[PDB]
Amino acid sequence: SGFRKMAFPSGKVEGCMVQVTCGTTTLNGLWLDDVVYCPRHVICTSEDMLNPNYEDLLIRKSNHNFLVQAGNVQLRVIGHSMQNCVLKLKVDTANPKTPKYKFVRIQPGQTFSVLACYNGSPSGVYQCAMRPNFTIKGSFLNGSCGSVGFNIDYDCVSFCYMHHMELPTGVHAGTDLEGNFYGPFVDRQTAQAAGTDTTITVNVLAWLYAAVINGDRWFLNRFTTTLNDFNLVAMKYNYEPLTQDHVDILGPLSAQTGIAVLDMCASLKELLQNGMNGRTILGSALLEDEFTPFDVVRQCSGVT
Amino acid sequence: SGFRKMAFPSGKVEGCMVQVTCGTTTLNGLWLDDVVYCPRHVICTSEDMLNPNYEDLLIRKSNHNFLVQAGNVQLRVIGHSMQNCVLKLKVDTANPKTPKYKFVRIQPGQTFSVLACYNGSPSGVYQCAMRPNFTIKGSFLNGSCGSVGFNIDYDCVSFCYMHHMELPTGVHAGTDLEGNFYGPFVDRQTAQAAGTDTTITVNVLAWLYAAVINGDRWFLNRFTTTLNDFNLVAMKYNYEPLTQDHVDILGPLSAQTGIAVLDMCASLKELLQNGMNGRTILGSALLEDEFTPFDVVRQCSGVT
Ligand SMILES: Cc1ccncc1NC(=O)CN(C)S(=O)(=O)c1cccc2cccnc12
Ligand SMILES: Cc1ccncc1NC(=O)CN(C)S(=O)(=O)c1cccc2cccnc12
C-alpha cells in the first residue's frame, strides 16, 4: 500500500550522461552508441539568444570545438551534424554503458522521468508529464539543458525528452531525441507564452482508482454520469475532454476495483463542483494528473 | 526555476540490489562488499508472523538455505548472522559495484530516497521523509521488503533505511542498516499503531523559501512573530515545535531571499489560520514538509 510519485530507476540513463562544452557554454549531452546528442543552442553565446541563425553559427564550428567529457575522460569528436534543434556529435568510442534504447515522441498527458544533470553529472530524478500545452513543469537551472526524459520497459530505455529551455513563466520546453520541440516552442529568447494548462482528465481518474486501491474512498459517491455530461463539467473546469479511448484504457482499473469508469467520472464531477472541503486524497489536497493509467497499474502491481 | 520532489540518482544503489530467498519467502537484499543485508523476517513463514522467535527460527537455517541472486547469477553464502532485525549474509564475492558508503541513522524530519525493489529488481525511486512518529509514507507491496532508503553526498551513499513492514493504517516501518527499527515498531504482525503524524515545521519553512525563490510569493505578508508565539500556533495545528537550531539551519535561505526566518514563520502562521483559499504554492494545495532546508539549497543551487 501507499502511492507515491515515482520515477524510473535512473542508472541506465546516468551511464549515458556526458558534458558538452562549445566555447564558453557548457550543458549536458546524451551518449548512446558513438553519438552524443545535445541541444544545438550549445553553440550560441547568451549575447545572440534573441535571433540565432543556427546554420550560420554552426559553419564557424569544427569537431575540435565541441568538448565532450564522460566522467573525467575526454571523448574524441569525429563528426557533427544538426538534426532539427539537436546536435549529434559522432565520437570515436561507443558508450560501453549504452542500454537498449528507443527514441519516442510522446503525446500530451504522457508521463516520464527526468534525470536532471549539471556538467554531465546527475543531480536528481523526478517524474513529469507532457502538459496539454506541450510544456513540462520541471526543475531546471542554467546548465541543466540536455538533461533527458525517459520511460523504461524492463531493460529498454525510451528517450522522449531533452531539455532546452525555460519560458518567462518558469515552465519548460524541449524536444524529442530527433530535435523536434514539443509544441510551438523555439530555441530563441523571444515572447513564447504557453497556452492553457488544462488538467489531464484520464490521469486524474487513474489516480482516483489508485486512491480507492489504497484505501482512500471518501470521495466515492452514489452517482453516475455520461461521457457527454461529464465533458460539459470537464470543459467548465479546464479539464481535457474524456474520450471512449480513455474509458477503454481505464478498463483494467475499473475491473480491479469494480467501479465503472462513468461512476468514477461522477465522483470526479462532484469533486470539481464541491471541492475537497479540506480533505485529502493520497496525501494531496488537489486532483493529481501526472499518473497515467499505465503508471497506476505498474505501481499498484510492482512491475520491475 | 521550478521545484520538484526530487530523489537522488539511483544507479549506485541499483548496483547493490540482490534477491534473497529463504524457503518460500523472497525479498530484497543490499549487497555491499562481501555482505548482503536483508530483513530477518525472510526466515519466517506468514503462518508464524504473530509471534516469531527469530533466534529459534534461525537455528534451523544454514548458509545453503539463503539463496542470494545478483541479476541472474547465484552468490555463494559462506556465513550468516543476525544483527538486531537484519541478517548479514557473508558471500564469497565482494560486490564489484560497491559504491563508497556509510550506514547512518537519521532523525525524524530527515528526507531520503527509496529505491523500491521486487525480486532484487528496481521498480522505481521516490523521495520520503522519516515522519515525527517514525513511520514513512512509502509505496511498498509484498516483496518490497529489503528495499533501502539513502542519501548521496557526491559519490558516498549514506544508507539510512531498510523496509521491513506495513502497519494496518498503510504506513511503513523499517530499520537503519544496523537493524534497529525507527520508532517503537517490531517485525511482528501485532497491534502497532503509529503516534501523531505531526508536520515537520522546519521543512515547511524551507519549502516556503523555495516557493519565494521560484516566484510563488502571494503568501508573503506584512507580519512577523516570535518563536514562542509561532509555537503556540504550531502546537494547535500539530506542527513540530520550531527551535533556534531550526532557525539557524534556515539562515542561508533567509540570507538568499532577504526574508527573516520569523517573518516567514508569520506567513506560515497566517497560512495555518486562514488556509490556502483555493490557491496553490509550488503546485501544491497543502503545505509540503518533505523538503529539508538542505534539499532546498541543493535543488535551488544544482548540487551534483
Ligand atoms: C536558464 C535556464 C534555466 C532552465 N532551463 C533552461 C534554461 N536556459 C535557457 O532557456 C536557454 N536560454 C538562456 S535562451 O535565452 O533560451 C538561449 C537561446 C538560444 C541560444 C542560447 C545560447 C546560450 C544560452 N541561452 C541561449
Ligand atoms: C505486505 C507488505 C507490504 C508492504 N510492506 C511490507 C509488507 N510486509 C510486511 O509487513 C511483512 N508481514 C507480512 S508481517 O506479517 O509483518 C511478518 C512478520 C514477521 C514474519 C513474517 C514472515 C513472512 C511474512 N510476513 C512476516
Curated annotation (Swiss-Prot), chains A, B:
Subcellular location: Host cytoplasm; Host Golgi apparatus; Host nucleus
Cytoplasmic side stretches: 1-304
Consequence the record notes for mutating residue 205 to V: In strain: Zeta/P.2
Catalytic activity reported: TSAVLQ-|-SGFRK-NH2 and SGVTFQ-|-GKFKK the two peptides corresponding to the two self-cleavage sites of the SARS 3C-like proteinase are the two most reactive peptide substrates. The enzyme exhibits a strong preference for substrates containing Gln at P1 position and Leu at P2 position
UniProt superkingdom: Viruses
Regulation: Inhibited by pyridone-containing alpha-ketoamides compounds 13a and 13b. In turn, alpha-ketoamide 13b (tert-butyl (1-((S)-1-(((S)-4-(benzylamino)-3,4-dioxo-1-((S)-2-oxopyrrolidin-3-yl)butan-2-yl)amino)-3-cyclopropyl-1-oxopropan-2-yl)-2-oxo-1,2-dihydropyridin-3-yl)carbamate) inhibits SARS-CoV-2 replication in human lung cells. Inhibited ex vivo by michael acceptor inhibitor N3. Inhibited ex vivo by compound 11a and 11b.
Signal sequence annotation: none
Active site as annotated: 41, 145
Mutagenesis or variant effect for residue 132 to H: In strain: Omicron/BA.1, Omicron/BA.2, Omicron/BA.2.12.1, Omicron/BA.2.75, Omicron/BA.4, Omicron/BA.5, Omicron/BQ.1.1, Omicron/XBB.1.5, Omicron/EG.5.1
Chain residue numbers at which the record places covalent cross-link Glycyl lysine isopeptide (Lys-Gly) (interchain with G-Cter in ubiquitin): 5, 90
Segments forming domain Peptidase C30: 1-304
Subunit-structure text: 3CL-PRO exists as monomer and homodimer. Only the homodimer shows catalytic activity. Interacts with host FBXO22; this interaction promotes the proteasomal degradation of nsp5.
Summary of the function given for this chain in its UniProt record: Cleaves the C-terminus of replicase polyprotein at 11 sites. Recognizes substrates containing the core sequence [ILMVF]-Q-|-[SGACN]. Cleaves and inactivates human TRMT1, preventing tRNA guanine(26)-dimethylation of tRNAs. May cleave human NLRP1 in lung epithelial cells, thereby activating the NLRP1 inflammasome pathway. May cleave human GSDMD, triggering alternative GSDME-mediated epithelial cell death upon activation of the NLRP1 inflammasome, which may enhance the release interleukins 1B, 6, 16 and 18. Also able to bind an ADP-ribose-1''-phosphate (ADRP).
UniProt protein name: 3C-like proteinase nsp5
Species whose genome carries this gene: Severe acute respiratory syndrome coronavirus 2
Residues of the full protein shown: 3264 to 3567 of 7096
